[model samples]
Target: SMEQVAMELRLTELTRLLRSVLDQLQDKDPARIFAQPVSLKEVPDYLDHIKHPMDFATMRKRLEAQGYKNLHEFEEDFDLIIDNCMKYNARDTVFYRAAVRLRDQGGVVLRQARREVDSIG
Candidate 1:
């Protein structure tokens, strides 16, 4: 029963942190195009060029479903969204914008880095 609460609390912290990073990108995005899934009809080659397609909606879905394991896992999944955008788009937004700063942002810290030293054990 105690372990279960840790699991629940861990996910709660993870989701809250992930949202900060996600919201940072969406709220300040130039066009906020990445807020949702890519339009297949509008851009036919999206799937062809990017095999692992990710977007805000799907992540949020996964977010609510407990699809993430930890902070690093969430970071990798979040990285996937930007990675696909860089692969498919040639815009400056993906090149040198907030897309590149999530890792360094003050509120977007990934706890995996300090897990050892910061561990309660």
Candidate 2:
């Protein structure tokens, strides 16, 4: 039971890191930080940071398998992330780096999963 808890904790940490990366990206972006009068040209990059960490379809499937089929119900998590990113300036580098690692690792995993989907019947 303790080993299972430890494994789950690692996954929780990874997921938290992923969300933290998105939050940090929002903070690091000048438009979001300064609340700049964003032109239509800069909108795409701003939206780019609002990603699902991977292919939406596969991400949805993985979430479903994990017993989380409705992320729409979890808006508070994102709302909090947005609140902190917009308001908090005292960020730690180690946590930021861990988030980046999780983001990149998720990218790799999603790419492989997408290829699998593409090859399916």
Q: Kindly give the number of clashing pairs for every candidate.
A: 0, 0
Roughly what TM-score does model 1 have, to 2 decimal places?
A: 0.68
Predicted candidate 1 versus true structure: per-residue lDDT over 51-84, tens digit per residue: 9877778888887787876656766776787777
Query: Which parts of model 1 have CA positions greater than 4 angstroms off?
Result: 91-121
lDDT of each: 0.64, 0.39
TM-score of 2: 0.28
At residue 28, give the lDDT of candidate 2.
Answer: 46
lDDT of 2 by residue, 1-121 (tens): 9999976765554444344433443344333332222233755564444432222233334433443322332333333333333332224644334334444444454454435333541
Off by over 4 Å in 2: 1-92
Give, for candidate 2, the lowest lDDT window spanning 10 residues: 29-38
Clashing pairs in 1: none
